[PDB]
Amino acid sequence: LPILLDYWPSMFGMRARVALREKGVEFEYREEDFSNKSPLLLQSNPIHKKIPVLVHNGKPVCESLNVVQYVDEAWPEKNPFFPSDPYGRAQARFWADFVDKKFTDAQFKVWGKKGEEQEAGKKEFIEAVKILESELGDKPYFGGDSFGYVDISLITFSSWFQAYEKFGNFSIESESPKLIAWAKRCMEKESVSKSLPDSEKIVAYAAEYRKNNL
Amino acid sequence: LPILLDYWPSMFGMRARVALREKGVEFEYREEDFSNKSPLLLQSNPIHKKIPVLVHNGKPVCESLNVVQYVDEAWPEKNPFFPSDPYGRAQARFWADFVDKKFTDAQFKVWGKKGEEQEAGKKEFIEAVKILESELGDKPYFGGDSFGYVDISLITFSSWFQAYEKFGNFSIESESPKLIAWAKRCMEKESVSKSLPDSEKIVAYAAEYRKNNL
Amino acid sequence: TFDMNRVIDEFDEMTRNAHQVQKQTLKEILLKNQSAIYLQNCGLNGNATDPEEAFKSMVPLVTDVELEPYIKRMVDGDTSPILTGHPVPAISLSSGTSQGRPKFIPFTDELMENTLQLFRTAFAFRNRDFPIDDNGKALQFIFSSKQYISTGGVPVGTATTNVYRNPNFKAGMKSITSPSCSPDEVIFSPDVHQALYCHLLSGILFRDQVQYVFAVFAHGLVHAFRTFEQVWEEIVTDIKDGVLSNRITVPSVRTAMSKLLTPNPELAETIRTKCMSLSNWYGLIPALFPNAKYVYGIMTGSMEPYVPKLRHYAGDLPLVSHDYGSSEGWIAANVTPRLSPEEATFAVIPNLGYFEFLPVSETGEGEEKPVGLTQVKIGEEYEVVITNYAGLYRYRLGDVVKVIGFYNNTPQLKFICRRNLILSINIDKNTERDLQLSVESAAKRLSEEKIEVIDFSSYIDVSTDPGHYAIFWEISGETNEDVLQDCCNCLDRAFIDAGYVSSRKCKTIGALELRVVAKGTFRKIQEHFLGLGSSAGQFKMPRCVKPSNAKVLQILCENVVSSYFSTAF
Ligand SMILES: N[C@@H](CCC(=O)N[C@@H](CS)C(=O)NCC(=O)O)C(=O)O
Ligand SMILES: N[C@@H](CCC(=O)N[C@@H](CS)C(=O)NCC(=O)O)C(=O)O
Ligand SMILES: CC/C=C\C[C@H]1C(=O)CC[C@@H]1CC(=O)O
Ligand SMILES: CC(C)[C@H](N)C(=O)O
């Protein structure tokens, strides 16, 4: 059994749990204390000391996109996250990185900041969301005909959409119901219905992170 | 014929050039004036407007590391950059992510900024080249038993090594030698020996950058 | 940006680039749709190099019945994406009926571009043949006043509703239409029959510089001119005193006419002296605006017979035929509009879908496989199937078309058609005869007012507890609530079956709501449908709505000219 060192509000951690559970893999979930990080995480990651990291075959694999690609690659016989063609796995990667960087910074300043960046970031969020709806054109999912790579990349950001609708104070549903409803399309599936923790609690911890630092 | 959108001192454009030339493609380079980003680039990435851009079947392939695995997958028969196991792939990808974060930014700090910013960047890069040195351990390369994925990723920084040594007024070699040492080793590959421009010029572009923003 | 010459050569070479632009459009449409579930079931994934080969041989053809549940699943609370992707901002309907039940179809902003772009063209071909003044106006008997919200809290709507109050309508159509007579408020007036009256009044209002009259259909025109025919004495009077007729009751739009109105007595002397000299309103369309370059609308297919009563209205003024398309996907444009209605044909526009045709060539019908768009045979008739942004993939709409010629490398289509008809049996009934009889029974309470009932529709609403059916109505003129309330009772009192007797008397299904709608409503489901991309077999309106109906539904809620739940019961 593979061991997951994760963080319950971590969306990237949510990437790993969604992927492994999206297949048919039985794995053990471990809560990390970032004040008291397990001997397992420091011996698995002595540098960034980051989650998520999964040990399989006595081997630690770290980074969310990297753990998930590792999942596709180690158990590829049922539900592939990738389409068969080079350019299309390339277009899941292109948008994986998009969700991962510019989109994840924009959202990070949504829940993590006050004033100027909060607002201009609300923009950014409305903008990046605006592009991702556009290229998807009309796909129920993302990375292939079923649950994909870039969809697991973004679905974890469903459990923060509601935090973003209070601190960013928008309704991306009433300016783009397209996206959260991928997310709720994707919520009919059990990798999302039992991996992504409760929406309210994310709001709680997002607001409480806001409480702890000024 | 593969059309690459490149920029003479792009470590990232070099990632693409080293990748392709490492594989076995005959391709064409076009030099960019980022003041006038080309019609076909502004069609390739109308928002980032960023290179390297390799164009195949009339489909733009973007982002440096995205572009080099593109290289792997476009011609999968002769020169693989990854080894056969999913684990090793994840470690190489892991370490490619390493090259791209604290390492790139720290170098950006050592030649691009000064003073309070500078030494922060200087301890950061010596730290980086040290974890680096530790993981290079012994191996001729990085991402497999031969010329690898991330070999491509970080070799292209070794022509900027000169600019780092001079503005830093350092010597990144007596603190971590096997690295630069591995780098002029990696210079013998015809992929990097002909894709990378001269370092006095690269130094000089850092000098133009510096002289502009003091 | 709208211009004449540079757009049309793009299009000439677009029309000659016919095959790559659709194969591209198909491969666009696949690359934007790689994630579609039915395709997983079909075996698809991306680029390949037999993709068009893989497509026509691996993905099966489909019907309204089979498509209902998927786009149904999109709409009801599960906001979830299926045969398109993105839960679409709107859903559409198809004329005729899915074994008699309603069908659902996804709408994306792509369609809005489709609308705009082919019109950007379309105005350019007609203004080529009928050049227009850049400071004039047009009379538009057009409406988009209505917006319901589906059972899932999801918007699903007509081409109409979706185009005019789309955020992109105003900026986009501003450079390709002579400014509308009507302030948009009266266009989206909750009462489009009082809005009509004001609409005909609006186009009547800025006539001297008016370049054309328009409706999608010339029956939008002859019914507008049969509406016109029903209302201009009162039009003199309401306009004369600078006080609008007491016929109008809606205060937001009444505010819109009051900001416009003041007392002016000479002018009436005039209107009355013109329209008289005719022998019954032959060439009225140039009477109203002697300077309209044309009368624009679809004039082929299911309704050749009112081009003559409109020619009758239009006189010797040229009668110009409208381009073809729908919410399901647009097809073909008359890039030579100067052509007569009977000989009028329309050329396909390239990136709005990927198109295929089933031949009728054998007897009836024919077991042969579809051929490509440039592979169609001249003079011969094929039925169109559609692959596009509207959630339809090699979809058999069910309509037979004739090929008349080629505009450079692109073909010109003809429609001799009318009804896409074979039916089957259902569950939105309450026998169609019963529902028609319901309207008939209750509507003669309105007939006491010198009124007839022009058309009707319905809706099953099972979000509410209990659920209630919603009966819909288009009448020829305005009246008061008491009689309409009475009317709803009679619709309840007219479904004569033993069954729903147990139902509503037990109220396990809650009281019938009659939302009476305003004029042009069922005219717009029509105006939607002949233009629809297929063939002219597009006119049997579905009469009662399961949750799977869409074109009549956005129409239903916001033009509640009144809405009532039965006081009996
Ligand atoms: N980009 C990396 C870094 C992730 C990262 O920084 N994660 C946060 C939690 S989501 C964390 O673990 N921070 C460690 C800390 O607070 O020092 C990844 O996605 O794994
Ligand atoms: N993450 C990028 C790094 C590229 C980068 O920094 N590119 C610079 C080359 S100097 C660039 O193209 N900047 C675009 C601009 O500022 O116009 C990639 O690998 O594509
Ligand atoms: C393209 C503009 C969208 C609106 C379309 C409607 C009109 O403006 C007239 C009909 C047309 C629909 C049709 O051709 O089927
Ligand atoms: C009016 C137009 C947008 C469309 N054909 C409809 O009637 O729905």
Walk me through the domains of chain A, giving residue ranges and CATH numbers: 1-84 (3.40.30.10), 85-214 (1.20.1050.10)
Nearest residue (CA) to ligand 4, atom 6:
C528
Q: Can you say which residues of A are annotated as belonging to the binding site for glutathione?
A: 10, 51, 64
Residue to mutate, A17, A51, A105, ligand 1, most ligand atoms under 8 Å from C-beta: A51
The count of C-alpha atoms lying within 13 angstroms of the C-alpha of C107, restricted to the half-sphere facing its C-beta, is: 26
Return d(Cα A180, Cα A186) in angstroms, integer.
9
> Are residues C189 and C250 in contact, defined by beta-carbon separation less than 8 angstroms?
yes
Q: Let me know if C506 is exposed, middle or buried by CB neighbors in 10 A (0-12, 13-18, 19+).
A: exposed
Q: Does B62 contact chain A (CB < 8 Å)?
A: yes
- CB-based contacts of C244, cutoff 8 Å, min separation 6: C238, C254, C257, C258, C261
Q: Which of C29, C35, C82 sits opposite A142 (nearest CB)?
A: C35
Name the residue of chain A whose CA is nearest to C388's CA. Answer: A138
Q: Can you say which residues of C are annotated as belonging to the binding site for an L-alpha-amino acid?
A: 160-164, 524-528
Residue to mutate, A8, A12, A53, A153, ligand 1, most ligand atoms under 8 Å from C-beta: A12
Q: Does B86 contact chain A (CB < 8 Å)?
A: yes
> Are residues C495 and C435 in contact, defined by beta-carbon separation less than 8 angstroms?
yes
Q: Does B69 contact chain A (CB < 8 Å)?
A: yes
The CA distance from A183 to the nearest CA of chain C, in Å, is: 8
Helix (H, G, I), strand (E, B) or coil at C319: strand
- CB-based contacts of C30, cutoff 8 Å, min separation 6: C44, C46, C51, C55
Return d(Cα C421, Cα C316) in angstroms, integer.
36
Q: Let me know if C281 is exposed, middle or buried by CB neighbors in 10 A (0-12, 13-18, 19+).
A: middle
Q: Around Cβ B58, how many Cβ atoms within 10 Å?
A: 8
| A neighbour chains, 3+ CB pairs within 8 Å | B, C
Buried b (16+ CB within 10 A) or exposed e, A97-120: bbbbebbbebbebbbbeeeeebee
Measure CA C362 to chain center.
Answer: 34
Q: Around Cβ C425, how many Cβ atoms within 10 Å?
A: 8
A87 to chain C: which residues are within 8 Å by CB?
Answer: 46-47
Tell which residue, B208, B122, B205, has the closest CA to residue B168.
Answer: B122
| B neighbour chains, 3+ CB pairs within 8 Å | A
Buried b (16+ CB within 10 A) or exposed e, B83-116: beebbbbbbbbbbbbbbbebbbebbebbbbeeee
Q: Which residue, chain included where needed, has tokens 């529902």?
A: C435
Return d(Cα C313, Cα C139) in angstroms, integer.
15
Which residues have C-beta atoms less than 6 Å from ligand 1?
A: A 7, 10, 12, 34, 50-51, 63-64
C154 to chain A: which residues are within 8 Å by CB?
Answer: 177
A63 to chain B: which residues are within 8 Å by CB?
Answer: 93-94, 97
Return d(Cα C248, Cα B70) in angstroms, integer.
67
Return d(Cα C538, Cα C399) in angstroms, integer.
8
Contact: A47, B73; criterion CB under 8 Å: no
Pairing of strands C319-321, C325-326: unpaired
Tell which residue, A136, A151, A156, A138, has the closest CA to residue A51.
Answer: A156
Six token digits for residue C534: 């297929």
Return d(Cα C300, Cα C60) in angstroms, integer.
32
Q: Does B25 contact chain A (CB < 8 Å)?
A: no
Nearest residue (CA) to ligand 1, atom 18:
A63
B66 to chain A: which residues are within 8 Å by CB?
Answer: 90, 93-94, 97
> A12 CA distance to ligand 4 centroid (A)?
46
Tell which residue, C60, C98, C106, C102, has the closest CA to residue C81.
Answer: C106
Q: Does A62 contact chain B (CB < 8 Å)?
A: yes
Q: Name residue C403's beta-bridge partners.
A: C413
Return d(Cα B20, Cα C20) in angstroms, integer.
30
